[PDB]
Every structure is written in C-alpha cells, then in structure tokens.
C-alpha cells in the first residue's frame, strides 16, 4: 504493498494489542516514516483512543480502515475485538471516515 499518507485511516497491529483503528500521522519533527537502511518501514500513527496516542507501527502491519460495518471488523472478521477501547475507537474512526 500500500501507499500510506497522513490522514489515511488504518487498522494497525502492535505486539500486545488488538488491531487498533488509527490515523496515519506526520510527526512534526521526525516525519511520517522511519526508513532506515536494511530495516522495514515504520509509519507514525495516531490511535483513536480517548486521547490522541501516537506511536510507530510496522508498515506491513497496517491495513485500510473501512468502517465498523465492514466484514473484517465484525465478529469473526480479521479486525474484530470486543474490547471497550476498540469499540470507542471504531466510533471515532467512523466519524473521521465520514468526513471524506
Ligand atoms: Mg485510556
């Protein structure tokens, strides 16, 4: 693969966390990507948590966010969780999506 850009809504997988609805984010000093020689690309993302958490995620552990209604987001789907933080985040993400 994909080509990510600030403002893209994505599911992101971090070790120790469910798939998280996130916003690709330009860090105002360190940029959008970590592109070190030999390493895999990481993307700076903003999680749709109660407040805007930011971190870096392996680009190959991102997938496009396509609404809470998408098959991948519902039960048995790739991205489904029942954790309360995820349900709140999908809501915010759907709002962010419906602008676009
Ligand atoms: Mg919290």
């Amino acid at each position: 693969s994909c080509d990510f850009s600030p403002g893209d809504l994505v599911w992101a997988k971090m070790e120790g966390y469910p798939w998280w609805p996130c916003l690709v984010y330009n860090h105002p000093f360190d940029g959008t990507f970590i592109r070190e020689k030999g390493k895999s690309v990481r993307v700076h993302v903003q999680f749709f948590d109660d407040s805007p958490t930011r971190g870096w995620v392996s680009k190959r552990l991102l997938k496009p966010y396509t609404g809470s209604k998408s098959k991948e987001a519902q039960k048995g789907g790739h991205f489904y969780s029942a954790k309360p933080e995820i349900l709140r985040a999908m809501q915010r993400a759907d709002e962010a999506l419906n602008k676009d």
Side-chain angles (χ1 to χ4, degrees), residues 2-38 40-58 60-62 64-68 73-74 76-97:
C2 318
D3 293 279
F4 298 97
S5 164
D8 291 338
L9 317 187
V10 293
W11 291 90
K13 194 59 173 70
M14 283 224 88
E15 158 133 285
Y17 286 90
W19 284 93
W20 250 97
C22 290
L23 176 66
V24 177
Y25 195 71
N26 187 58
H27 186 300
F29 300 85
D30 315 334
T32 303
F33 303 100
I34 308 167
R35 296 166 305 187
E36 295 174 356
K37 182 180 190 175
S40 61
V41 174
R42 305 170 75 195
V43 194
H44 199 57
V45 301
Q46 198 175 86
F47 303 73
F48 286 98
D49 205 344
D50 288 358
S51 63
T53 312
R54 295 165 302 100
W56 285 264
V57 180
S58 152
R60 80 185 72 179
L61 299 181
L62 298 187
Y65 187 86
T66 52
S68 41
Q74 287 154 355
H78 196 173
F79 310 131
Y80 173 87
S81 181
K83 297 189 202 298
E85 57 276 37
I86 299 310
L87 304 173
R88 313 199 293 274
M90 283 195 286
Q91 285 311 316
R92 307 191 181 96
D94 291 339
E95 299 168 19
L97 195 53

